[PDB]
Amino acid sequence: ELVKHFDANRKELRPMRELEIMMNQRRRMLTWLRRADFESYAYVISKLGLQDIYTXXXXXXXXXXXXXXXXXXXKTNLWQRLRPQLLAEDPVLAAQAVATAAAEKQRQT
RNA sequence: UGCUAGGUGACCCAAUACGGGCAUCGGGCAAAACUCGCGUAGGAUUAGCGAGCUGGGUCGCUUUUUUUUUUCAGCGGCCCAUGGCUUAUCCUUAGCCUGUCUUAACG
Predict the structure, then answer these.
(1) Torsion, Cα of A52, A5, A73, A64 (10° steps)
(2) Coil, helix or strand for A22?
């Protein structure tokens, strides 16, 4: 609901720090819980439907079939960078992004 | 592989009588050569490595030789898995360690 609010409001700045605090503590919680109780980890990111976000390294891929996804660069504003990360780790938000993109492109047409 | 001692000689030299060289065998211990575990000058005004930059298969990788058992590497050619590192590369200083001097010691 905050990412819906935050394509709605762009120039908000105070609890966007709090938005970062939720994203970072959620990352801490998954990366702890995978080490701690793996069945609960898999259970939750199947029920919510989330990918793996755990950590010259590999992000715990399988034995074979080593499909990969790594992004490293070779001055920004806020929401122009905080939007595609939160789109990137979460597939439901990517689905909402492509759905509202098709919605606006066929609503303007 | 290299030394020293042995034992052999259808060989050569020496011998008022006998030992040396020369070939081969094998006992003793030995070097050599390779591999990896770590250590190691600073520089971001060196940030990507202009590269096979790492790995797997295939050969080529110039010898059989005592009983159940025995023989490295990208080093080159070919495919191929697309990865390997990130003080990685690049620069400039510099042989390295024990040493010697000092400090009470650490340095």
Answers:
(1) 20
(2) helix
